[PDB]
Amino acid sequence: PDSATGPQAGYVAKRSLSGTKTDASLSEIPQSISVITRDQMDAQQVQSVNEALRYTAGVQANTTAASQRFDTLSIRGFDVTTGMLRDGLKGNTAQAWPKVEAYGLERIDVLKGPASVLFGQNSPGGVVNQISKRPLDKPFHEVQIQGGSFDRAQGQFDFSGPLDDEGQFLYRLVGLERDSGTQFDHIKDDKQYFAPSFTWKPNDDTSLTLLADYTQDTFGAPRVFLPAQGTLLGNPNGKVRHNVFLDEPGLDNDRTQYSLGYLLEHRLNDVWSLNSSARYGHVNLLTNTASGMSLAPDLRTLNRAAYRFRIVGDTYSLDNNAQARWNLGSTQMVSLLGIDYRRTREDYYLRGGSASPIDIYNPVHHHHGVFDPSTPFTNTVQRADQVGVYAQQQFTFDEHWVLTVGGRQDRSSARTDNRMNDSGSKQDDEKFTYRTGLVYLADNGLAPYISYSTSFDPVLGTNFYGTPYKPTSAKQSEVGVKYQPPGIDSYITLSLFDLTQENVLTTDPAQRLNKIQTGEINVRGIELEGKASLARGLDLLAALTYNDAEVSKSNNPLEKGKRPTDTPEKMASLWADYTLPEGPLSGLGFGAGVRYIGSTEADAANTQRVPSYTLLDAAVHYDFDKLIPAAKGLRLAVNATNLTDKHYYEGCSLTNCSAGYDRSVIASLRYRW
Template sequence: MQTVRRSVSSFWKASFRPVSCSAMHENKRLKLYAATLGCGVLLALGAPARAAQTACKVDRHAPAVRLSGTVTDQSNGVVIGANVTLVCGDYHEQTQTTADGSYSISAPQGSYTLEVKSPGYQAIHEPVRLSEAGAQLKNLKLQVGTAVSIVSVTAPTGYVATSSTTATKTGLPLIETPQTISVITGDQLVQRDVQSMNQALNYTAGVGTATYGADPRFDWFNIRGFDESTYGMYRDNLRWQSGQVEGEIEPYDLQEIDVIKGPSSVLYGQNTPGGLVNLVTKRPEAYPSNELIAQFGSFDRKQVQGDFGGPLDANAHLRYRIVGLYRNSGTQVNYVPDDRDFIAPSFTWAPSSRTTLTILTDYQHDNTGWSQFLPAQGTLYANPNGKIPTDTFTGQPGFDFFHRQQWSLAYLFEHHFGKIWTFRQAFRYSRIAFDGNDAFGGGLAPDLKTLYRFGYSDALTLGMYAVDNQAFAQFKTGKVQQSVLAGLDYSHADALQISGFSAAPSIDIYKPDYHQTIATPVPYLKTDQPSWQNGVYLQDLVKFTPKIIATLSGREDWTGMATKDLLFGAPTTKQNPSRFTGRVGGTYLSSIGLAPYFSYSTSFLPTTGVNFYGQPFKPTTGNQYEGGLKYQPRHTNSFITASFYNINENNVQEPDPNNPNNTVQTGSVRSRGVELEAVASLMHGLDVHASYSYDDEKVTKAVPASEIGTRPVLIPKDLISLHTHYTFSSGLLSGLGLGGGVRYTGTVAGDAANTFILPGYTLFDVSGQYYWKSMEFQVTGTNVGDKIYVPICTSISYCNYGSRRNVIGNVQYHWGSWRHIF
């Protein structure tokens, strides 16, 4: 079944379709259509526009007519997952081609523009008339365009994604990839008005979010039982963090988020075996599109943001985009702000369909505070003095702060040589610096109300650059189709960290006195830690028949790191581990859209430092067996994945039973589980995202032996979520959208011995939108039941509350050409 998509991005992109600029000037009738229908617009800043959709007409009360057919390429091979869209003004019907390349879409009688888009092919824009004569057949053939990659990928249209550029770096359709992948599209981000990475990942199978509770500084999350907040963060397929939790990405600057489950070292190098998250930055696009949003919400939140862009010449060879945001806000904790300044200009030069160069820049400044160290008595457990309020601030005004500045400069280059070879190069330099003080709680006195405190300071400066070079070839040997990717990447990071400590006066946690003085923290740590990684990889995607696909890939990594003690002059420790990782997988594509698959993959992660005897630590290694079934039903805009996995991680650090000052790498962890995830647009305007995850993670080797069989800390065993959204497309309620979601997080272990078991909790979210002409009004609420819960408690002295109810309202205005404004 097909769907009506009226999300912000789809709703407005549908209004701007390619017609030559000269035609706009020469054809007054076309100009009139553009003005009256809102379909053709002039370019931003007064440049000639590339913009108008041809005249269209639709009677939403007329009977629906079915249009179907098959989408193939030049060699008559079927194209899976192509976006097929019928557009007329603000009316927008969309579906995707299924496993046999077929599509079926229905719309009321009328005249439309039929659009077909698929990564790596030139888009089709054709006029179509649906008449009362009945069902119509239209087969379509796509011409090869620029090879797909993270360089040229555009935001996926609609709620359901069918491909990803992250898992194989080639844009292979999800149904052909022998690994579990979750794609959070731009429409999903807009529909839920996502304000953080944690919020973006809330409904994704296998991902636990907000591991440390309400913390405005960082996004903490785990995948399949392994923390991915540091080594698991990538941006445009380039490493973004290097083992320190330091930066935070503004979600308004993202067009897509890809979550890859399981070991991914074969294409990305050092990483934990849980997987990775790749953040795809917004790119300049070939049509003018602008929006301005004013936002107000809980905790005195005030925010204004804008996204402006389009072509700078008639043929859209030059394009620009500027994304910006200003926020002044409090949080659920007293004296902790959540202020941000952000701007991200970007430019694209595409002199031909073979060559693309995109430059991405951004700058961000944050003013916020720390998460709270609250005692278990009064949060998780009862306290005779009562419940500790969730807005309790354990720090000291005037002493506590957290400031961060981060910026980056990147370019993405791609050139297509003929029909076979493509060269790509991606580069990013980023610099992140933060500085902060915190007076944190250290447990309660016997009266269970006096909180011991300590002063702490932390400052970190990280400079990092990463480059990835790729040679990609697509060719046929007899009946066998191959896509070969060869790559060489390099990254270098240098982190300078200074930490200090001091005593601090106690406070009554129920009646805190903030008129006290805390001594300046005395540095106890000052280290410089340069590190680098160089890897070479090769991947071959082999399609033996239209139904049998094999994935073979391998990589060799060479790494280096050093830890320089700049405070006490201790000897510098150096490590240079190297490792081979690989992946092998197979997929069978059935004619009904079912695709069983199996894969085996490995990972490695260097461990910094040396043991008590001066011996460098060995890298942590991991491996995964995964099998499952993917289903992309025919005639239905949906995608379903069911997977089973078994991950083993070895060389895990633990205390040496024979020497309390030493650490040994004798530990092992096994993560075994099941994931179910379905994303669908079931009928006109109804979107559904459902997921279930069960993760049975256990310690399999440990000293002492009593910890064998225990559950690693802060990893939920069960995750269940359901989010639905319906947009009315006709009648009196046309333009109204209503949504809601429920999220359940199961029990977690607080400490290694599992003496703290935190209860599970269920949260509810809601949203509502109304589209009126060029305006949109939106209200979203997370944890609308205002449930008070404790997601973390690692000891009797350290617990933290989860996020309280947060309601945000938006007023949005969208337009095409700036001439509509001036």
């Protein structure tokens, strides 16, 4: 076997624990599941989780250029920031979200559709499962340095191997530091990251891995205001520089985070296995901003305001399970029972004040100008206790049919108290979730599945007549066929699905200051997606996505509601990398990819379209080895995003647009021994 976790060459992963909480071939999994191999992440020099999801079907990379604080992305229509996982553990509070330095990962698993079945509360979208780099059993050493666009300068390392002669002791030090500017003025893109790790494996029964890390980054403010009137729409004052800086320079916009955790598997015999994961995770986010409120009557002056807010959150996440592999018939059984705590605390506060308005065309900033961010606003400490019990059984009937069944009970509780006025408030929810799925594994490699699963996310806080909101729910059907070609290293997935979210907060007609749970979002789509690492070291990928989205202000099947904002009908993408294997220029390589994103709708009402766009990507790269043999192990790699520098809008409201990624270059020198 290949590992469901450990490293691998090629673009084509063959198995994952993400879809099933057990070691499973991709065809065995009754959902639709994607694995982004490390290698691919490198042949594209990707630099952030969100950026590496750009070539995945039914997944869309909504984090904007100007504000890079989070890996904000969307699976099958829904934002999945409550769907993020590191090593199968959530590490996120209501407001405290974490950002994982993509260098630190060994692969990304993406499970499309509702998965509360295994992971508890979650967005309808799916789970992004960020699998950490873990201590390797044979030495491996990598240093690389890079430069590139916007005065970029970055250094990093990755060291592994045994400490002893058995491989009873294994380490891994990983580190990266970066000083970069970004296509905009006075916006930095800085990181520092270090992650020690350690695997003690006495024998083959017990295997315990230790996982620490500290990540300190800087980025720009959030809610970058660029007006529509001037970009997408007309403005009588003329077009606006798509990349204008309209906040104030030199304000604190950063965050520390760190975590320590362990992963322990342990065999008991031939049938029983116990499993435990848990991690402490801190996140200390700070933002100072002078963000744009609105454009004054003259369509030229931006009124603004001062804000400071520190969000601090601490996570204790813990997941224990036990697994059994027997046979009653000549029919292989796989059983699974588990428990799943989380406890969180989040320490919030917001402070407001005034901000000199600034001009859209002639921006001007200066200090000794007004910025006073001290009026208390909100101020919180919010504790949660989450617990799930889950189980699931898989049946493999005489080596061909995989039937998969499972469910989860969940308790979610959330004690929020106002330091502003010395009141407490408490919310308490429960839901059963579940999944049914059948797969037939044909001999010719084809493998059709059907399945149904549910999902739920709480809605925190109290409505208007002072009653707590209800959790949102999601149900999904999927037919789909996955494929393994005769004997080539390749994987194609075709999936068709209908996915629906219920109790979506709509604005109440009776009381214009109230939200009622009347709303449906419905999304039916197709996702064709394939990867191959071919015969002679050419790699490949394609991902197509058609999505029918329909917002339903309230259940009425003679409606025909509208598309939601910023959601594409089509998104396709392609990529090939290629290293020359012999002959004169042995070691020289090229890489190209085309990414496509379709029209969106600006306004809830669907009267205003936001331009489609296609972007090209490129790479040359050279391994010295043949040329200077004494420099064996060295690598020059140059990569371009948006090669042709199309200046596009990421998304538009009717108020404002988002500046798309202008052409960016990363060049690097990498050395290995």
